[PDB]
Amino acid sequence: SNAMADLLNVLKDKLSGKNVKIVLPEGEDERVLTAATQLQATDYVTPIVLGDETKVQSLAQKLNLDISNIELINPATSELKAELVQSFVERRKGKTTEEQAQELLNNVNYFGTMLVYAGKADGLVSGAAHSTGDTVRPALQIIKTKPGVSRTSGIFFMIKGDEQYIFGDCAINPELDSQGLAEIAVESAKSALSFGMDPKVAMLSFSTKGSAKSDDVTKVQEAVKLAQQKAEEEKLEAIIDGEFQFDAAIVPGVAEKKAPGAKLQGDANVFVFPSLEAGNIGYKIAQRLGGYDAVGPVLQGLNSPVNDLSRGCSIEDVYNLSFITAAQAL
Amino acid sequence: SNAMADLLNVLKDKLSGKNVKIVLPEGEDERVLTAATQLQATDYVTPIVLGDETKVQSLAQKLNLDISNIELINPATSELKAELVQSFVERRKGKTTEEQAQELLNNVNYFGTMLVYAGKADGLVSGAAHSTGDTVRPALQIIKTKPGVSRTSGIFFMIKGDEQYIFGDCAINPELDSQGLAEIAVESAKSALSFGMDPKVAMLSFSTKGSAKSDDVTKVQEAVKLAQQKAEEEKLEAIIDGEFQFDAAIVPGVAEKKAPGAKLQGDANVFVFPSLEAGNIGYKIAQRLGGYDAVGPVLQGLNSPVNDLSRGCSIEDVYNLSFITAAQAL
Numbered sequence A, B: 001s002n003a004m005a006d007l008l009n010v011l012k013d014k015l016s017g018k019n020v021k022i023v024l025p026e027g028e029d030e031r032v033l034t035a036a037t038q039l040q041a042t043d044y045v046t047p048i049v050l051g052d053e054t055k056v057q058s059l060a061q062k063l064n065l066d067i068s069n070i071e072l073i074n075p076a077t078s079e080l081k082a083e084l085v086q087s088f089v090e091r092r093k094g095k096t097t098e099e100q101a102q103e104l105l106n107n108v109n110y111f112g113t114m115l116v117y118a119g120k121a122d123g124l125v126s127g128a129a130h131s132t133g134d135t136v137r138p139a140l141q142i143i144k145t146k147p148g149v150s151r152t153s154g155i156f157f158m159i160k161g162d163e164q165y166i167f168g169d170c171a172i173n174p175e176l177d178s179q180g181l182a183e184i185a186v187e188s189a190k191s192a193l194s195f196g197m198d199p200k201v202a203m204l205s206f207s208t209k210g211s212a213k214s215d216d217v218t219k220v221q222e223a224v225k226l227a228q229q230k231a232e233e234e235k236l237e238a239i240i241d242g243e244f245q246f247d248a249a250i251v252p253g254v255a256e257k258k259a260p261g262a263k264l265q266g267d268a269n270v271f272v273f274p275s276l277e278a279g280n281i282g283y284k285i286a287q288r289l290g291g292y293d294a295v296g297p298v299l300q301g302l303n304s305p306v307n308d309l310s311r312g313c314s315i316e317d318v319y320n321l322s323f324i325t326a327a328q329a330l
């Protein structure tokens, strides 16, 4: 099996001919620039690279890359800047002056975020470069969360051989109550659909179907009710159930004994952790002790997708995250 | 490798000739009775089986077991009952009458617990039989936690091939603050020593050494300080450190990057989870996705050890848990 290639093949079938454009603000980053050349040579994702044109071209030359067919935009000299300034001023509802917007939009991450907001591109991948802060920051200001969603959350694809799961929230929210967990469950189901999965979402705990009693157990039980309510409202093509211990969620024989007649019978493929402590630890255990590759974090909940690279990313990481982001944009 | 046999070999070297006696209250349980015969045929653990003598002998016959060399005690007719009644009345400080004690001590779990308290046996393993409640309940009343320990906690040996880790608290305490986590860390270190390990205890979080800020991160940071204080006080032969994400605790290269100069460098063998949600989920992930066997739960913190079997245990589980309990008694 080749789990990463198999995930990409599902995303490619969705993306083929859709012409999705992903902004890569960090054109002076070697990994990003090289990944842009690779994406350009597919049909699925069109990279829009930002930076100083002379510096980016010099870096390409150093790297022995032909970037002549890549769209490369320097914010300060772009014919689009004027419209993006005006839109950013309108979006900010008077919180930013025209002069401030003219200044801010010279920043590659702000400019890139505005390309997405203005419909000139579909999503954005950044974070490889030290000068990029949190990729998500301008996105929160400009793009915002989707109607009905309070906050972003972070998911990972956990992949090994022929197995592919989604785990979340593993990165973002350190304090979660029932409403927050239910939000994560619904967003994760939607993300799983974007990625071509048939979502079966287990809300995890140390209890299975009332086997323990505590405030944290009640929290997850109430989250299941709210998530099911939100899903059914929207006729989401997903099953959401809980509370389950991890084995009851993923082992049919355990489910049969501990959760008889539940909607899930040990066949979950999306796992919602009851806290960030649990999720961060749990994906790291699956990664190291299970030998699963952890692809992410992938952000969900925004009106348009943006995702954040590690400073230590590889070229392949940029390529893969660009595909994931492009799939999210559909 | 044979991870379970290898753990038993360490425990056998400690137990050889020490004549440790483990009470098995459930002599009318097939698994327990068969395990008693197996333990009797070693030198390490002496089983003290309780029950109605005629019923236990009839069950042995049905099972084709020779139990003639096993110590078998019927509480109601035991020559020891009178002394155990008097001791139980004294231990209860007037909360139980002599008549009530005479009645209660006919119960195999109470009688067995009193054998331990009175120094007639060293530990106790129960829980296979439906009529046994929580094995620990009489223990809490009679044996109690060790001086300086508030509560029991539950650990698992996570074993695969040549790898052996301790995870806790994975079973008992649904609400833990810094003091409670520090208690678990110190008890787990002590348990690891009992089991022949050189304990390197990582206190887990979603943060590594200040990489995130939240109340839950502060909780674990403060727990590390308190645990180190308690360990150093007692010149415990253990290292306790944190806070660590799971990969920083167990992967040297991650530790070097994320926790430079920390006391642990990716070489933890004892893992203290920041909550029961995290621990219960985390061991189940290690078990199912990692293919680790999870041996437990093993209780720690009592003045004398008692441990609890699943109703669905095997014969081997009773045998193994008897060895673990006997090791704890040293």
Ligand SMILES: [Cl-]
Binding pocket: A228, A231, A238, A239, A240, A241, A263
């Ligand atoms: Cl559902």
Ligand SMILES: [Cl-]
Binding pocket: A204, A205, A206, A207, A244, A245, A246, A247, B280, B281, B282, B284
């Ligand atoms: Cl669990």
Ligand SMILES: [Cl-]
Binding pocket: A296, A308, A309, A310, A312, A313, A314, A317
């Ligand atoms: Cl990355």
Ligand SMILES: [Cl-]
Binding pocket: B228, B231, B238, B239, B240, B241, B263
């Ligand atoms: Cl230490």
Ligand SMILES: [Cl-]
Binding pocket: A280, A281, A282, A284, B204, B205, B206, B207, B244, B245, B246, B247
């Ligand atoms: Cl972690």
Ligand SMILES: [Cl-]
Binding pocket: B296, B308, B309, B310, B312, B313, B314, B317
């Ligand atoms: Cl068991």
